[PDB]
């Protein structure tokens, strides 16, 4: 794969099966995800009713940024009391499904998309508040610099979403900026990750992708994040900044932009792994070139004729 | 010096011996077998194998006057082969009593005994008893400290030279009573009982080769340091008149042969016979017998079409790998008389790790 899926593939396939199934069997399935996230899928009272529950170490921060309001808006009547050891939960009853295969499919998709929906609330808070600041700056363009300066501190979201990544973001009247305070702790991934983070920033300087968010990189923090608690300028973090401008979160594009920015460091981590398989095929191709330099030391002798199983042959 | 390639053996050939009439030769392949080759017009044909050894055969020798072959191996044995009236060969195991491999074997000039060098720190001097119908072995053991790499017998039947991996060349009495008559007085000694030591000459590297002068009055030996040393003794308990080392510019000599009292041919990892000449005043490397030391459109067959595509596929390019300029393509392991009276060798043969058997005329 060149790109990661945004949704949990197991939850999508399992719900696409059970929403079609003539005879649902029971399930009891803990399922891992990226960034230390985990799901429990089960039928805890009837084979008819599936409980899907999410566990996520940053969920208490995400609730401060309007997450429960967005999850109630997305999942509606299916929202359920949290399961013990899990932060959020949804109950789907297999006799209560939508009347069409296409509504069933987009519900199986919506429930598989749950990790990126819980994590989308700080981005929707930034996009909707940028629209307020945009309207105020359109009212008085000479007051806008002070609105942007106060929103840079009063409307900043930080999410410590895993112990080696902090995502920091804020609205200003024409943009959302998001900074990945980013690190690789495994030493070969830190070495290959320096090449990946360098070529990522240099790619944005080429003519072909000027349509993309502005990207910046350093390894001290961007000025407006230097005093956010848990950011630290000597602690081997690099800081990838994306400036999303109004064109990157236009109404036709908000949800794809959110899905795609959250998976940034996951695509980089995955491709640092997949680059090793590429280097290994690059290596064994020129092991096969060096074979031909040793084969010229073999003196030329005809081998006896052999059948496909290696048994000796007696003709010609 | 003219050279003729007599035969190309399919496998390496650390030793060969011709019979007295040069009409057949025996050779050790690198396996447990020994190959007997007869003339086939101007060519040679594989007449028979011997295969009585269990492990790799290291050395083989053919007695001129009595027409017997002796063979040695890493199986720690020797076999003597003797011709039957019907033309087949009778094998006979010799109990060498060696703790490790037999490494090198030579028949004595009177052919009444042979000696086997070993990795066991000893040499088995083997002789026959008509009272028992046994070959029996005596161990030379006093000064020897490592693998014996080569042997040579003095022209008198008693004295044995040995080249050793302890960087020394030994002259030892292999006198055996009721086989030898008493030896004449010599520059090496006169009170000459079994395992008396006539010399312990030093080398810069492992002594691959040893050889007495045709008169017996001097010993040449060759070291892994790419030198030939020629030793001229004075008397028992006395240092030599001269101990002349000539240091070569090439890879080491593995084998060594006096052409006359004033000249030696030698060959080895240099892939080429060299000539050294001199006397007790001094010795010099004087010639290379192989001219290859100087580094010196039509219809096309199926085997050239096919091999040029196999070379493109398996190797870098169509182009065949060139020969070395020497006749031998690998180290030349042994160097043996072929023609002329003793004291005036007119031609000699060599065999090598490339399997070529080659005749050289001086």
From Swiss-Prot, chain A:
Superkingdom classification of source: Eukaryota
Protein keywords: Actin-binding, Cytoplasm, Cytoskeleton
GO-annotated biological processes: actin cortical patch assembly; actin filament branching; actin filament polymerization; Arp2/3 complex-mediated actin nucleation; endocytosis
InterPro entries the UniProt entry points to: ARPC2 (IPR007188), ARPC2/4 (IPR034666)
Location in or out of the cell: Cytoplasm, Cytoskeleton, Actin patch
Gene Ontology cellular-component annotations: actin cortical patch; Arp2/3 protein complex; cell division site; cell tip; cytosol; nucleus
Record-linked SUPFAM superfamilies: Arp2/3 complex subunits (SSF69645)
Any single Pfam family the record assigns to this protein: P34-Arc
Gene3D superfamilies: 3.30.1460.20
An MF annotation (GO) of this entry: actin filament binding
Functional description taken from the UniProt entry: Functions as actin-binding component of the Arp2/3 complex which is involved in regulation of actin polymerization and together with an activating nucleation-promoting factor (NPF) mediates the formation of branched actin networks. Seems to contact the mother actin filament.
Family note: Belongs to the ARPC2 family.
Record's subunit section: Component of the Arp2/3 complex composed of arp2, act2, arc1/p41-ARC, arc2/p34-ARC, arc3/p21-ARC, arc4/p20-ARC and arc5/p16-ARC.
Protein name as catalogued: Actin-related protein 2/3 complex subunit 2
Organism field: Schizosaccharomyces pombe (strain 972 / ATCC 24843)
Lineage of the organism: Eukaryota, Fungi, Dikarya, Ascomycota, Taphrinomycotina
Curated annotation (Swiss-Prot), chain B:
Gene3D superfamilies: YVTN repeat-like/Quinoprotein amine dehydrogenase (2.130.10.10)
Residue spans of the WD repeats: 8-47, 52-91, 97-138, 143-182, 202-241, 327-361
Keyword vocabulary terms for this entry: Actin-binding, Cytoplasm, Cytoskeleton, Repeat, WD repeat
This protein's GO CC annotations: actin cortical patch; Arp2/3 protein complex; cell division site; cell tip; cytoplasm; cytosol
Entry keyword Cytoplasm: yes
Keyword Repeat: yes
InterPro entries: ARPC1, WD40/YVTN_repeat-like_dom_sf, WD40_repeat_dom_sf, WD40_rpt
Principal subcellular localization: cytoplasm
Domain of life: Eukaryota
UniProt record, GO biological process: actin cortical patch assembly; actin filament branching; Arp2/3 complex-mediated actin nucleation; cortical actin cytoskeleton organization; endocytosis
MF terms in GO: actin filament binding
Compartment annotation: Cytoplasm, Cytoskeleton, Actin patch
Pfam families to which the protein is assigned, alphabetical: WD40
Subunit structure: Component of the Arp2/3 complex composed of arp2, act2, arc1/p41-ARC, arc2/p34-ARC, arc3/p21-ARC, arc4/p20-ARC and arc5/p16-ARC.
Family: Belongs to the WD repeat ARPC1 family.
Function: Functions as a component of the Arp2/3 complex which is involved in regulation of actin polymerization and together with an activating nucleation-promoting factor (NPF) mediates the formation of branched actin networks.
Name listed for the protein in its UniProt record: Actin-related protein 2/3 complex subunit 1
Source species of the chain: Schizosaccharomyces pombe (strain 972 / ATCC 24843)
Taxonomy of the source species: Eukaryota, Fungi, Dikarya, Ascomycota, Taphrinomycotina
């Amino acid at each position: 794969m060149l790109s990661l899926d945004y949704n949990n593939i197991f939850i999508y396939e399992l719900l696409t099966e059970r929403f079609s199934s003539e005879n649902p069997s029971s399930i009891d399935q803990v399922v891992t995800d990226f960034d230390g996230v985990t799901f429990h899928i089960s039928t805890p009272e009837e084979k008819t009713k599936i409980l899907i529950s999410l566990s996520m170490k940053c969920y208490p921060e995400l609730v401060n940024y309007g997450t429960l309001d967005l999850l109630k808006q997305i999942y509606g009547a299916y929202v359920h009391e949290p399961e013990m050891g899990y932060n959020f939960s949804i109950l789907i009853d297999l006799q209560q499904l939508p009347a069409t295969d296409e509504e069933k499919e987009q519900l199986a998709m919506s429930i598989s998309m749950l990790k990126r929906n819980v994590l989308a609330a700080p981005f929707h808070r930034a996009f909707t508040k940028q629209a307020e600041l945009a309207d105020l700056a359109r009212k008085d363009p000479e007051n806008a610099p002070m609105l942007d300066k106060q929103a840079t501190s009063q409307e900043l979201m930080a999410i410590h979403y895993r112990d080696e990544e902090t995502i920091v973001l804020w609205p200003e009247h024409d943009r959302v900026t998001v900074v990945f305070s980013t690190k690789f702790r495994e030493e070969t991934d830190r070495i290959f990750g320096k090449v990946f983070l360098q070529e990522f920033v240099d790619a944005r300087r080429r003519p072909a992708i000027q349509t993309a968010p502005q990207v910046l990189f350093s390894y001290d923090p961007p000025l407006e994040i230097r005093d956010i608690q848990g950011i630290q300028k000597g602690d081997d973090f690099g800081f990838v900044t994306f400036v999303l401008f109004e064109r990157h979160f236009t109404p036709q594009n908000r949800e794809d932009c959110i899905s795609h920015i959250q998976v940034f460091r996951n695509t980089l981590h995955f491709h640092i792994k997949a680059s090793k398989a590429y280097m290994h095929q690059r290596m064994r191709k020129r092991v096969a070139d060096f074979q031909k330099v040793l084969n010229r030391a073999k003196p030329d002798v005809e081998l006896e004729r052999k059948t496909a199983t290696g048994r000796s042959f007696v003709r010609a | 010096a003219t050279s003729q390639v007599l035969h190309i053996l399919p496998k390496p050939s650390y030793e060969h011996a011709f019979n007295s009439q040069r009409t057949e030769f025996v050779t050790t392949t690198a396996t447990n077998q020994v190959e007997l080759y007869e003339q086939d017009g101007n060519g040679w044909k594989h007449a028979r194998t011997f295969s009585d050894h269990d492990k790799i055969v290291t050395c083989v020798d053919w007695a001129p006057k009595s027409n017997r072959i002796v063979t040695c191996s890493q199986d720690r044995n020797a076999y003597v082969y003797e011709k039957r009236p019907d033309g087949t060969w009778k094998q006979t195991l010799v109990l060498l009593r060696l703790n490790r491999a037999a490494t090198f074997v030579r028949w004595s000039p009177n052919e009444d005994k042979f000696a086997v060098g070993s990795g066991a720190r000893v040499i088995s001097v083997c002789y026959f008893e008509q009272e028992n119908d046994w070959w029996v072995s005596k161990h030379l053991k006093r000064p020897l400290r490592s693998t014996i790499l080569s042997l040579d017998w003095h022209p008198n039947n008693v004295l044995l030279a040995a080249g050793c991996a302890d960087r020394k060349a030994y002259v030892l009495s292999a006198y055996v009573r009721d086989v030898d008559a008493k030896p004449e007085a010599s520059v090496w000694g006169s009170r000459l009982p079994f395992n008396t030591v006539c010399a312990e000459y030093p080398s810069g590297g492992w002594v691959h080769a040893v050889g007495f002068s045709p008169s017996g009055n001097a010993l040449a030996y060759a070291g892994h340091d790419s030198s030939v040393t020629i030793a001229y003794p004075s008397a028992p308990e006395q240092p030599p008149r001269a101990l002349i080392t000539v240091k070569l510019s090439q890879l080491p000599l593995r084998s060594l042969l006096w052409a006359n009292e004033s000249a030696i041919v030698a060959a080895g990892y240099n892939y080429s016979p060299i000539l050294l000449q001199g006397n007790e005043s001094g010795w010099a490397h004087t010639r290379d017998l192989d001219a290859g030391t100087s580094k010196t459109e039509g219809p096309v067959s199926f085997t050239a079409l096919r091999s040029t595509f196999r070379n493109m596929d398996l190797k870098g390019s169509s182009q065949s790998i060139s020969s070395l300029p020497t006749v031998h393509q690998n180290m030349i392991a042994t160097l043996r008389p072929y023609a002329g009276t003793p004291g005036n060798i007119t031609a000699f043969t060599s065999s090598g790790t490339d399997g070529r058997v080659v005749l050289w005329t001086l």
